[PDB]
Every structure is written in C-alpha cells, then in structure tokens.
Amino acid sequence: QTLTYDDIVGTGLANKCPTLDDTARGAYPIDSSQTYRIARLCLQPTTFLVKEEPKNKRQEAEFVPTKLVTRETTSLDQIQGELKVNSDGSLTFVEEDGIDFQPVTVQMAGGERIPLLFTVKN
Amino acid sequence: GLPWYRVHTVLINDPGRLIAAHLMHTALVAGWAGSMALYELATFDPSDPVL
Numbered sequence A: 001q002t003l004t005y006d007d008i009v010g011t012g013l014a015n016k017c018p019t020l021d022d023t024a025r026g027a028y029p030i031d032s033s034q035t036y037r038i039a040r041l042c043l044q045p046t047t048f049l050v051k052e053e054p055k056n057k058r059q060e061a062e063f064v065p066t067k068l069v070t071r072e073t074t075s076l077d078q079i080q081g082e083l084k085v086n087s088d089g090s091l092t093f094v095e096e097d098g099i100d101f102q103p104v105t106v107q108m109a110g111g112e113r114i115p116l117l118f119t120v121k122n
Numbered sequence B: 001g002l003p004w005y006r007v008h009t010v011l012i013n014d015p016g017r018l019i020a021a022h023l024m025h026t027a028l029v030a031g032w033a034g035s036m037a038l039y040e041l042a043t044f045d046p047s048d049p050v051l
C-alpha cells in the first residue's frame, strides 16, 4: 500500500509535504540529556504575497496576492540539522543541509513578475 | 459626371448597396472602438486610482 515513484510521478504530490492524521494531537517528550536532530524538514508554500510600494510614504503598504508562474517547483524538503536542547529548556534547530532553496517567480496584477529565492538557508 | 461631393448619391435608389454602405460604416465605428480600447490598455497605468 506504500506509494512508489510511478504512483506519484506527474501528480503534483512530489511537491507536497506529508500531513498527519487529525488524531495527531500528542506530545513528544524531550530528554535534556539526549541529543536530537531534525531528520527531515519540509516546507510547502501555499501563498506568495508581495508588499506593494506606494508613492506617498505616509500611506501604509499592504501585501497583495500574486499568481505563481513557475509551477509545482516551490517546496523546500529533505532539510536536516541539529536540534539543540538549551539550558533554559528551549530547543534550537540549526539547519545544516538539504534542498533548502527554490527560485520562484510570481506575477502581480498587471503583469509585473517577482522572482525570489524562496529559502531557509542557514 | 457626378462632382466629387455627390459620389455617394448613387445609393439613393439602391437599398441593397445603401445597407452595404451602412454595414461598412458600422464596421469602421466598431473597429475604432476596439482599436481605441486596445491602445488605451497599452498605455493605461492601473496602479493608482487615487492620484
């Protein structure tokens, strides 16, 4: 029942991050003496907003919608890194490697194209 | 012969060609409206309806 490449190729699922059941409302214990890592971090963008640039700097600018024109090529995935337990009990993720960038072009109303390097590098 | 300012009077007793002339005029006016709108769209800046 596990899906293979040929089940997935061309469907768009390859650009989608995994989801968890609605039953996944638990808790993962952290032992401050154990070391941890994130074996896989996946980020799937669903919305790109671009801040408009107004002529009068008194007017507050807003984020407007855009149309993605570079197809299902946007997600960051296979990202891994150390997950530190800090002395105050907080956790710090330190990204080390992975597919941690995607060039993306979105288009504003009126046709202006906005390329960006969607990323979480370092 | 007809002087230059009377050439179109040949339509007076020709209903079919009068319709043809009226059709042609209608085509030119509708074509102007389309051309005019396209030219405006090529020049219109939509980014500031305030100023």
Ligand code: CLA
Binding pocket: B002, B004, B007, B008, B010, B011, B020, B021, B022, B024, B025, B028
């Ligand atoms: C609505 C427009 C229109 C229509 C439906 C008619 C219809 C008619 N004309 Mg008339 N005519 C018109 C406008 C029109 N004319 C204009 C503007 C002029 C001055 C040039 C004339 C001068 C004229 C003469 C001398 C004669 C007719 C005649 C006739 C009849 C036969 C067709 C013909 O020979 O045309 C003639 C051909 C034209 C008028 C072509 C006009 C070209 C225009 C001015 C330029 C268009 C070029 C291009 C598309 C745009 C340039 C843009 C620029 C930025 C480069 C027919 C009833 C004939 C007739 O039956 O007489 C008894 C005839 O001898 N017309």
Ligand code: CLA
Binding pocket: B004, B005, B006, B007, B008, B009
């Ligand atoms: C619906 C409006 C309309 C219609 C269907 C007509 C139709 C006619 N007119 Mg009349 N006329 C009109 C309005 C109209 N006119 C208006 C508003 C005026 C005052 C300007 C006149 C003054 C007038 C005179 C003094 C005469 C006519 C004559 C005629 C007859 C022959 C025209 C001809 O062959 O010209 C051919 C025209 C050309 C070959 C070139 C004309 C070029 C003009 C001057 C400049 C360019 C015009 C431009 C291309 C068009 C855009 C127009 C738009 C902005 C309105 C024909 C029945 C004649 C007649 O009675 O014959 C027996 C005649 O002597 N008309």
Ligand code: CLA
Binding pocket: B015, B018, B019, B022, B023, B024, B026
């Ligand atoms: C009862 C049916 C009927 C209908 C529906 C019309 C309608 C029209 N006639 Mg009139 N007419 C009629 C009876 C009718 N007439 C009779 C019995 C006579 C005596 C023979 C006339 C003599 C007459 C003359 C001399 C002229 C008209 C013109 C016009 C048109 C002016 C508006 C225009 O061009 O808009 C712009 C056009 C549109 C928005 C397109 C509309 C969709 C079209 C009508 C589809 C055409 C398909 C159809 C199968 C073709 C035949 C149409 C015909 C039955 C009217 C309009 C379509 C004028 C004209 O044709 O100018 C260009 C014109 O000069 N009529």
Ligand code: CLA
Binding pocket: B008, B025, B028, B029, B032
């Ligand atoms: C209600 C609206 C309306 C009316 C009543 C008319 C009426 C007329 N148009 Mg049409 N036209 C219209 C809207 C209208 N137009 C629109 C919105 C467009 C798109 C821009 C046109 C584009 C158009 C074209 C291309 C032509 C007409 C022509 C005509 C004339 C055909 C009958 C004729 O033989 O006159 C005889 C001519 C006259 C009576 C002369 C009228 C003079 C007008 C009123 C002022 C022009 C003065 C001055 C010389 C203009 C210089 C322009 C120059 C610098 C380029 C008639 C006067 C045709 C024409 O004039 O054929 C000769 C013609 O070729 N019209």
Ligand code: CLA
Binding pocket: B026, B027, B029, B030, B032, B033, B034, B036, B037
């Ligand atoms: C299905 C047909 C259709 C439709 C839905 C449209 C729709 C449109 N037109 Mg186009 N057009 C058409 C056919 C059509 N057009 C045809 C056949 C021509 C060539 C004649 C044009 C030439 C044209 C031009 C030149 C322009 C448009 C424009 C427009 C836009 C503004 C309309 C407007 O302000 O009208 C206003 C309409 C009136 C004020 C109607 C006046 C009616 C008079 C008063 C009637 C008087 C006689 C009547 C018999 C009296 C008795 C009435 C009785 C009830 C008592 C709108 C998108 C405008 C635009 O934005 O272009 C991009 C524009 O400039 N159209």
Ligand SMILES: CCCCCCCCCCCCCCCC(=O)OC[C@H](COP(=O)(O)OC[C@@H](O)CO)OC(=O)CCCCCCCCCCCCCCC
Binding pocket: B005, B006
């Ligand atoms: C065909 C209709 C054209 C009329 C256009 C009139 C526009 C002026 C406004 C009305 C003034 C009224 C005076 C009427 C006086 C009057 O009643 O005349 C009436 C006359 C017809 O009268 P008749 O049938 O009795 O003819 C008398 C002839 O035998 C002459 O002797 O009409 C004309 O002459 C039409 C030509 C005028 C043309 C004027 C010059 C137009 C040139 C335009 C230049 C365009 C350049 C374009 C660049 C791209």
Ligand SMILES: CC1=C(/C=C/C(C)=C/C=C/C(C)=C/C=C/C=C(C)/C=C/C=C(C)/C=C/C2=C(C)CCCC2(C)C)C(C)(C)CCC1
Binding pocket: B028, B029, B030, B031, B032, B035
């Ligand atoms: C065929 C066909 C087709 C096509 C069509 C087309 C493409 C059309 C176009 C059309 C057009 C594109 C048109 C245009 C027109 C224009 C006009 C008509 C103009 C006129 C002008 C005038 C008249 C002016 C005058 C003046 C001057 C010049 C100066 C100032 C003053 C005054 C204003 C007086 C199709 C595909 C649909 C299909 C079916 C068949």
Ligand SMILES: CCCCCCCS[C@@H]1O[C@H](CO)[C@@H](O)[C@H](O)[C@H]1O
Binding pocket: A110, A111, A112, B041, B042
């Ligand atoms: C009916 C033929 C239409 C041909 C042109 C249709 C494109 S639509 C065109 O697109 C541009 C870029 O997005 C805009 O800047 C402009 O406002 C708009 O009119």
